[PDB]
Design a binder for this molecule. Sequence first.
Ligand SMILES: O=P(O)(O)OC[C@H]1O[C@H](O)[C@H](O)[C@@H](O)[C@@H]1O
Ligand SMILES: O=P(O)(O)OC[C@H]1O[C@H](O)[C@H](O)[C@@H](O)[C@@H]1O
Lengths: 452, 452
Amino acid sequence: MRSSLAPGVWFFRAFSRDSWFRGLILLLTFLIYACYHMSRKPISIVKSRLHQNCSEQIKPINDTHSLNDTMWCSWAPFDKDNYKELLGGVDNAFLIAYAIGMFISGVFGERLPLRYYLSAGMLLSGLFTSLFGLGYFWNIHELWYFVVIQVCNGLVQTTGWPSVVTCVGNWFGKGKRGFIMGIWNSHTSVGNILGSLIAGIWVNGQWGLSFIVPGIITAVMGVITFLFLIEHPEDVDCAPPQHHISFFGALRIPGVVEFSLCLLFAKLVSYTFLYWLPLYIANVAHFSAKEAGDLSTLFDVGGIIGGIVAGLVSDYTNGRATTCCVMLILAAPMMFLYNYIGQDGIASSIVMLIICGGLVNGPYALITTAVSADLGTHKSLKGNAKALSTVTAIIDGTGSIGAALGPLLAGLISPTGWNNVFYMLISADVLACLLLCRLVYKEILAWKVSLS
Amino acid sequence: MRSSLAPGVWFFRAFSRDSWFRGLILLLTFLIYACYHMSRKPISIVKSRLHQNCSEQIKPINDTHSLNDTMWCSWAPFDKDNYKELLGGVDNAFLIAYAIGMFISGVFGERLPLRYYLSAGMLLSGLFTSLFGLGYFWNIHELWYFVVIQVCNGLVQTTGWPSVVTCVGNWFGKGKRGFIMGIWNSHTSVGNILGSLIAGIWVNGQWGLSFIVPGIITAVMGVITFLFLIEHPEDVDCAPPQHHISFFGALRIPGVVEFSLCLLFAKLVSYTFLYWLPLYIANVAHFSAKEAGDLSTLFDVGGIIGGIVAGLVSDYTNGRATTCCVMLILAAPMMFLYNYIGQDGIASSIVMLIICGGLVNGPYALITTAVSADLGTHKSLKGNAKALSTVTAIIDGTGSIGAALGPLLAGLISPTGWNNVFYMLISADVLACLLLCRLVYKEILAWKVSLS
Ligand SMILES: O=P(O)(O)OC[C@H]1O[C@H](O)[C@H](O)[C@@H](O)[C@@H]1O
Ligand SMILES: O=P(O)(O)OC[C@H]1O[C@H](O)[C@H](O)[C@@H](O)[C@@H]1O
């Protein structure tokens, strides 16, 4: 009768029954959509391996050249002078089929059960990623094989996000916001920050195992999701969350017509860093393809902090739009200085990657809730759920056209120098920071009430 | 309303509230007493490193010899011809202080709370194990340092077992027996089978990190036990388990006087294999000290199977004594054949280690319950709890004198050849299989009732 309860189980018994079921559904859907971004990454890390320089390459013992070849280093379709323009098509042959997939998944998406539709997405997303890596063993040398695998990997892998938002919205109720779901939104950057560390291993050597291993980890987390997913909280009998064509008319609203071209510009800037940075940092600093991949991750370790800090500060100050304009208008001088003096001493680049990763990938997770907060208050009121569904089908529609216009435009300027790429990416942030004609003009208008 | 419950959570919701609390207390006390046996092991794996042969050793670049030395391979007290007799004292300077510690812990043991007495045992058991390994960095060359560390590591590490049996006996109630606690009794062999794989790493080279790392893993599982230990099931309000000097007179009973000298012989045989086998297998097969340590584990992977099979078969057949005499009387020809033709072709030794590990370490976990079942039925009946406590203080008393007589006797015969060691270990099994004058004569007596 002398020994009391231990501190561990006395801590663990404080939490209610509901607060464990709304607590493991964050740990499930964290590791689901992190494993999606781990799958999408290694096409962007192996680009400095499919074409390379035979001058620094040692001569082979096995005679596979004809003494004037210099094409036995390169993989075979990516061999000529256009190794940057024939690869910028393979980069968005995934993204165009992804942008069509997000639009079709707004029709045939709710008509299937969620656990049978998310787990058959993570299995056919781990199949088609690895058929891209089995091209190394079957030594297929054709451009028309590596594209159809991408156009079918883009159309399958769109089952990830519109299932995760419903699985969390059934437990928490359409737009929670706090410190916990500020941590949960780093699930799309943890995926990139360990999709480069895992895939990087096999690069120098047999690169076919850079696509097979993240094509099997996604296939196993497609089984774990099939065994342990709970859609609606009435299943385990927990508590429900506590509650709170017309297209031509939709262009007449003073809303969408200036935010559709603000999600187009924002994602340009983020996705060209997602894809073409492990080739830039290998081409300028003259590293290998393991030192190019592992150095990039310091962009994402700033992308985490830029999502935490801008989420807290926009909760201390009411209105989540005036803290996006500051970071967008401040990102441009930092990436100009990073192109200016950021590739000689590593103490400069380890600072500059983290700063231009905080300032670019920060507001990316914030401007969507910022604009959806404004479009809730209109003459077309909150009761018209179909009207808000259609006018938020448009914004996230052109948001994914800004995806496909990123690396396609980056893979045609890049043979004319890298500096012209950063002029475009600096001009795009200032063209994207023109949301202030509406949201900032309303938010500073409502701060004079602090005088009263 | 179409998606049902998943198979995973529908499986997990079948088990009652009590069956998780009596289910994690096996997973805690498995990893506690496995981490004790991981700590005790690496003195037995590094013995082929503290003294070695300079003939196969390459000559050093740094001049640390005087051209006739041949003692710069050896560690400094273990250098002369008696490197097997000065090490057999360090082997049981742990075990004598352990045998005194088990007897003192029958007096001052219940007078402390269990969670404060098991967690200060796994911390002062990870301190004094690692002070033996800090002798490599402080390069102390003295026999009188490595013994006092052992005589204080033996006296502390006796807090392990008489706390684990009370922590399980409060939940399950003095002697459960089934397939689950047949698996739980392999916790003393999983510790040896991963105390050789972990410690083996640093042997060839800096052997001081063969004692520091299992001196820190025990120190961390001394914290995990401090946070998550539950003694009595009235603490979390589960269900209680369902229930069922006099020393000179204790020698007059027809019991103890022939089982005290049966636990003395049984543990001799097991402990000389626990300690002196990674030196035998390095000395005969002429391996290194990583191939000697990793080959030994195939003894313990037979020690697991010999504990599972003899636990099931003694439940299919009533009476747990006639299945111990078979394995003890059959172990002797197999270890004779293992000394005869078991060190030339590895396909022979990989069979023979597993067979003489099943037949030797099998009944070790079974004869104690076999004798405690018989001593429950006597004229001194089950009500006299102090009488059974005293007459089971004697059997487990001399059980630990059989510990200290093992490696001490093995470290004085071993400079006269290894074959004379196996003659002693073959004679000890036949001298230990003379329990049949009492238990087998009673058990075959009660099988004629199967005729009626
Ligand atoms: O993860 P993606 O495919 O880039 O989708 C982008 C969506 O997820 C991000 O992580 C943000 O949480 C959302 O603001 C954004 O709409
Ligand atoms: O684990 P040891 O210190 O060798 O203690 C020996 C005790 O534990 C073994 O694993 C068996 O379960 C018991 O029959 C034995 O009495």
